[PDB]
Coordinates of all heavy atoms in Angstrom, one line a residue:
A1 N -15.1 -8.6 2.7 CA -13.9 -7.8 2.4 C -12.7 -8.6 2.9 O -12.6 -9.0 4.0 CB -14.0 -6.5 3.0
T2 N -11.7 -8.9 2.0 CA -10.5 -9.6 2.3 C -9.2 -8.9 1.9 O -9.3 -7.9 1.2 CB -10.5 -11.0 1.6 OG1 -10.4 -10.7 0.3 CG2 -11.8 -11.8 1.9
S3 N -8.1 -9.5 2.3 CA -6.8 -8.9 1.8 C -6.7 -9.3 0.3 O -5.7 -8.8 -0.3 CB -5.7 -9.5 2.6 OG -5.8 -10.9 2.8
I4 N -7.6 -10.1 -0.2 CA -7.6 -10.4 -1.7 C -8.2 -9.2 -2.5 O -7.7 -8.9 -3.5 CB -8.4 -11.7 -2.0 CG1 -7.8 -12.8 -1.2 CG2 -8.5 -11.9 -3.5 CD1 -8.7 -14.1 -1.0
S5 N -9.2 -8.6 -1.9 CA -10.0 -7.5 -2.7 C -9.6 -6.1 -2.3 O -10.1 -5.2 -2.9 CB -11.5 -7.8 -2.6 OG -11.8 -7.6 -1.2
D6 N -8.8 -6.0 -1.3 CA -8.3 -4.6 -0.9 C -7.5 -4.0 -2.0 O -6.7 -4.7 -2.7 CB -7.5 -4.8 0.4 CG -7.4 -3.5 1.3 OD1 -8.1 -2.5 0.9 OD2 -6.7 -3.6 2.3
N7 N -7.7 -2.7 -2.3 CA -7.0 -2.0 -3.4 C -5.6 -1.5 -3.0 O -5.4 -0.4 -2.8 CB -7.9 -0.8 -3.9 CG -9.2 -1.3 -4.4 OD1 -9.4 -2.3 -5.0 ND2 -10.2 -0.3 -4.3
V8 N -4.7 -2.5 -2.9 CA -3.3 -2.2 -2.4 C -2.3 -2.3 -3.4 O -2.6 -2.9 -4.5 CB -3.0 -3.1 -1.2 CG1 -3.8 -2.7 0.1 CG2 -3.2 -4.5 -1.5
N9 N -1.1 -1.9 -3.2 CA 0.1 -2.2 -4.2 C 0.4 -3.7 -4.2 O 0.9 -4.2 -3.2 CB 1.3 -1.3 -3.8 CG 2.5 -1.7 -4.6 OD1 2.4 -1.9 -5.8 ND2 3.6 -1.9 -3.9
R10 N 0.2 -4.3 -5.3 CA 0.5 -5.7 -5.5 C 1.7 -6.0 -6.3 O 2.3 -7.1 -6.2 CB -0.7 -6.5 -6.0 CG -1.9 -6.4 -5.0 CD -2.9 -7.4 -5.2 NE -4.1 -7.0 -4.4 CZ -4.4 -7.5 -3.2 NH1 -3.6 -8.3 -2.5 NH2 -5.5 -7.0 -2.5
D11 N 2.1 -5.2 -7.3 CA 3.1 -5.6 -8.2 C 4.3 -4.7 -8.4 O 5.1 -4.8 -9.3 CB 2.4 -5.8 -9.6 CG 1.4 -4.7 -9.9 OD1 1.4 -3.6 -9.3 OD2 0.5 -5.1 -10.7
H12 N 4.5 -3.7 -7.5 CA 5.6 -2.8 -7.6 C 6.4 -3.0 -6.3 O 5.9 -2.8 -5.2 CB 5.2 -1.4 -7.7 CG 4.4 -1.1 -8.9 ND1 4.8 -1.3 -10.2 CD2 3.1 -0.7 -9.0 CE1 3.8 -1.0 -11.1 NE2 2.7 -0.7 -10.4
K13 N 7.7 -3.3 -6.5 CA 8.6 -3.5 -5.3 C 9.0 -2.3 -4.6 O 9.0 -1.2 -5.2 CB 9.9 -4.2 -5.8 CG 9.6 -5.5 -6.7 CD 10.9 -6.0 -7.3 CE 11.5 -7.0 -6.3 NZ 12.7 -7.7 -6.8
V14 N 9.2 -2.4 -3.3 CA 9.8 -1.4 -2.4 C 11.0 -0.7 -3.0 O 12.0 -1.4 -3.5 CB 10.1 -1.9 -1.0 CG1 10.9 -0.8 -0.3 CG2 8.8 -2.2 -0.2
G15 N 11.0 0.6 -3.2 CA 12.2 1.3 -3.7 C 11.9 1.8 -5.1 O 12.6 2.8 -5.5
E16 N 11.0 1.2 -5.8 CA 10.7 1.7 -7.2 C 10.1 3.1 -7.2 O 9.6 3.6 -6.2 CB 9.7 0.8 -7.9 CG 10.2 -0.5 -8.4 CD 9.2 -1.3 -9.2 OE1 8.4 -0.7 -9.9 OE2 9.2 -2.5 -9.1
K17 N 10.2 3.8 -8.4 CA 9.7 5.1 -8.6 C 8.6 5.0 -9.7 O 8.8 4.2 -10.7 CB 10.8 6.1 -9.0 CG 11.9 6.2 -8.0 CD 13.1 7.0 -8.6 CE 14.3 7.1 -7.7 NZ 15.5 7.6 -8.3
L18 N 7.6 5.7 -9.6 CA 6.5 5.8 -10.6 C 5.9 7.2 -10.8 O 4.8 7.4 -10.2 CB 5.4 4.8 -10.4 CG 5.7 3.3 -10.1 CD1 4.4 2.6 -9.7 CD2 6.2 2.6 -11.4
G19 N 6.5 8.1 -11.4 CA 7.9 8.1 -11.7 C 8.6 8.9 -10.7 O 9.8 8.7 -10.4
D20 N 7.9 9.9 -10.2 CA 8.4 10.7 -9.0 C 7.9 10.0 -7.7 O 8.3 10.4 -6.6 CB 7.8 12.1 -9.1 CG 8.6 12.9 -10.0 OD1 9.9 12.7 -10.1 OD2 8.0 13.8 -10.7
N21 N 6.9 9.1 -7.8 CA 6.4 8.5 -6.6 C 7.1 7.3 -6.1 O 7.2 6.2 -6.9 CB 4.9 8.1 -6.9 CG 4.0 9.3 -7.0 OD1 4.2 10.3 -6.3 ND2 3.0 9.2 -7.9
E22 N 7.7 7.3 -4.9 CA 8.4 6.2 -4.3 C 7.6 5.2 -3.8 O 6.5 5.4 -3.1 CB 9.3 6.7 -3.2 CG 10.5 7.7 -3.6 CD 11.4 7.9 -2.4 OE1 11.4 7.2 -1.4 OE2 12.2 9.0 -2.4
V23 N 7.9 3.9 -4.0 CA 7.1 2.8 -3.4 C 7.7 2.4 -2.1 O 8.8 2.1 -1.9 CB 7.2 1.5 -4.3 CG1 6.7 0.3 -3.6 CG2 6.5 1.7 -5.7
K24 N 6.8 2.6 -1.0 CA 7.2 2.4 0.3 C 6.9 1.0 0.9 O 7.5 0.5 1.8 CB 6.7 3.5 1.2 CG 7.0 4.9 0.7 CD 6.2 5.9 1.6 CE 5.9 7.1 0.7 NZ 6.2 8.4 1.4
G25 N 5.8 0.4 0.3 CA 5.4 -1.0 0.8 C 4.6 -1.8 -0.2 O 4.0 -1.2 -1.2
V26 N 4.6 -3.1 0.0 CA 3.8 -4.0 -0.8 C 2.6 -4.5 0.0 O 2.7 -4.9 1.2 CB 4.6 -5.2 -1.3 CG1 3.7 -6.2 -2.1 CG2 5.8 -4.8 -2.1
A27 N 1.4 -4.5 -0.5 CA 0.2 -5.0 0.1 C 0.1 -4.9 1.6 O 0.1 -3.7 2.0 CB 0.0 -6.6 -0.3
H28 N 0.0 -5.9 2.3 CA -0.3 -5.8 3.8 C 0.9 -6.3 4.5 O 1.3 -7.5 4.5 CB -1.5 -6.6 4.2 CG -2.8 -6.2 3.4 ND1 -3.2 -6.9 2.3 CD2 -3.7 -5.2 3.6 CE1 -4.3 -6.3 1.9 NE2 -4.6 -5.3 2.7
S29 N 1.7 -5.3 5.2 CA 2.9 -5.7 5.8 C 2.9 -5.6 7.3 O 2.1 -4.9 7.9 CB 4.1 -4.7 5.2 OG 3.7 -3.4 5.5
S30 N 3.7 -6.5 7.9 CA 3.8 -6.5 9.4 C 5.2 -6.4 9.8 O 6.1 -6.7 9.1 CB 3.2 -7.9 9.8 OG 3.9 -9.0 9.4
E31 N 5.4 -5.8 11.0 CA 6.7 -5.8 11.6 C 6.5 -6.0 13.1 O 5.6 -5.5 13.7 CB 7.3 -4.4 11.3 CG 8.8 -4.3 11.9 CD 9.6 -3.1 11.4 OE1 9.3 -2.6 10.2 OE2 10.5 -2.6 12.1
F32 N 7.4 -6.8 13.7 CA 7.3 -7.1 15.1 C 8.7 -6.9 15.8 O 9.8 -7.1 15.2 CB 6.9 -8.5 15.3 CG 5.6 -8.9 14.7 CD1 5.4 -9.3 13.4 CD2 4.4 -8.8 15.5 CE1 4.2 -9.6 12.9 CE2 3.2 -9.1 15.0 CZ 3.0 -9.5 13.7
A33 N 8.6 -6.3 17.0 CA 9.8 -6.2 17.8 C 9.6 -7.2 19.0 O 8.8 -7.0 19.9 CB 10.0 -4.8 18.3
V34 N 10.5 -8.2 19.1 CA 10.3 -9.2 20.1 C 11.3 -9.0 21.2 O 12.5 -9.0 21.0 CB 10.4 -10.6 19.6 CG1 10.2 -11.6 20.7 CG2 9.4 -10.9 18.4
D35 N 10.8 -8.9 22.5 CA 11.8 -8.8 23.6 C 11.8 -10.1 24.3 O 11.0 -10.4 25.2 CB 11.2 -7.7 24.6 CG 12.1 -7.4 25.8 OD1 13.0 -8.2 26.2 OD2 11.9 -6.3 26.4
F36 N 12.7 -11.0 23.8 CA 12.7 -12.4 24.3 C 13.1 -12.4 25.9 O 12.5 -13.3 26.5 CB 13.6 -13.2 23.5 CG 13.1 -13.6 22.2 CD1 13.6 -13.1 21.0 CD2 12.1 -14.6 22.1 CE1 13.1 -13.5 19.8 CE2 11.6 -15.0 20.9 CZ 12.1 -14.4 19.7
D37 N 14.0 -11.6 26.3 CA 14.4 -11.6 27.7 C 13.3 -11.3 28.7 O 13.2 -11.8 29.8 CB 15.6 -10.7 27.9 CG 16.9 -11.2 27.2 OD1 16.9 -12.4 26.8 OD2 17.8 -10.4 27.0
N38 N 12.3 -10.4 28.3 CA 11.2 -10.1 29.1 C 9.9 -10.9 28.7 O 8.8 -10.6 29.2 CB 10.9 -8.6 29.1 CG 12.0 -7.8 29.8 OD1 12.7 -6.9 29.2 ND2 12.3 -8.2 31.0
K39 N 10.0 -11.7 27.7 CA 8.9 -12.6 27.2 C 7.7 -11.7 26.7 O 6.6 -12.1 27.0 CB 8.4 -13.5 28.3 CG 9.4 -14.5 28.9 CD 9.9 -15.4 27.8 CE 10.7 -16.6 28.5 NZ 11.3 -17.5 27.5
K40 N 8.0 -10.6 26.0 CA 7.0 -9.8 25.5 C 7.3 -9.4 24.0 O 8.4 -9.5 23.6 CB 6.9 -8.5 26.2 CG 6.4 -8.6 27.7 CD 6.3 -7.2 28.3 CE 5.7 -7.2 29.6 NZ 4.4 -8.1 29.7
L41 N 6.3 -9.0 23.3 CA 6.5 -8.5 21.9 C 5.4 -7.4 21.6 O 4.4 -7.4 22.2 CB 6.5 -9.6 20.9 CG 5.2 -10.4 20.7 CD1 4.2 -9.7 19.8 CD2 5.6 -11.8 20.1
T42 N 5.8 -6.6 20.6 CA 4.9 -5.6 20.1 C 5.0 -5.7 18.6 O 5.9 -6.4 18.1 CB 5.2 -4.2 20.5 OG1 6.5 -3.8 19.9 CG2 5.3 -4.0 22.1
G43 N 4.1 -5.1 17.9 CA 4.1 -5.1 16.4 C 3.2 -4.1 15.8 O 2.4 -3.5 16.5
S44 N 3.2 -4.0 14.5 CA 2.4 -3.1 13.7 C 1.9 -3.8 12.5 O 2.7 -4.5 11.9 CB 3.1 -1.8 13.3 OG 3.5 -1.1 14.6
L45 N 0.7 -3.5 12.0 CA 0.2 -4.0 10.8 C -0.2 -2.9 9.9 O -0.9 -2.0 10.3 CB -1.0 -4.9 11.0 CG -0.9 -6.1 12.0 CD1 -2.2 -7.0 12.0 CD2 0.3 -7.0 11.5
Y46 N 0.4 -2.9 8.7 CA 0.2 -1.8 7.7 C -0.6 -2.1 6.4 O -0.5 -3.2 5.9 CB 1.6 -1.2 7.3 CG 2.4 -0.6 8.4 CD1 3.3 -1.4 9.1 CD2 2.2 0.7 8.9 CE1 4.2 -0.9 10.1 CE2 3.0 1.2 10.0 CZ 4.0 0.4 10.5 OH 4.7 0.9 11.6
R47 N -1.3 -1.1 5.9 CA -1.9 -1.2 4.6 C -1.1 -0.3 3.6 O -1.1 0.9 3.8 CB -3.4 -0.9 4.6 CG -4.1 -0.9 3.2 CD -5.5 -0.3 3.3 NE -6.3 -0.5 2.1 CZ -6.2 0.4 1.0 NH1 -5.5 1.5 1.2 NH2 -6.9 0.2 0.0

């Protein structure tokens, strides 16, 4: 099982409607908050 075969949104951009349904994300998204002054970071991984 890979991020290739996962049944995720691959071709609709964030913000689109279909038609009442808002697109919130594409495929597998990551976000990180880096605290450079304390040399630490956190993050999240989304499907």
Side-chain angles (χ1 to χ4, degrees):
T2 63
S3 47
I4 301 159
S5 63
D6 203 4
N7 298 331
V8 289
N9 171 44
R10 297 198 193 265
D11 39 24
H12 306 296
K13 310 176 82 175
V14 168
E16 283 186 33
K17 304 166 182 173
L18 309 169
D20 282 324
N21 289 325
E22 294 188 20
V23 170
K24 307 172 212 229
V26 180
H28 304 95
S29 58
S30 62
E31 181 168 334
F32 302 87
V34 182
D35 185 340
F36 283 109
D37 293 343
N38 294 123
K39 300 298 195 188
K40 295 186 170 313
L41 62 79
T42 65
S44 301
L45 303 186
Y46 300 95
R47 179 188 186 272

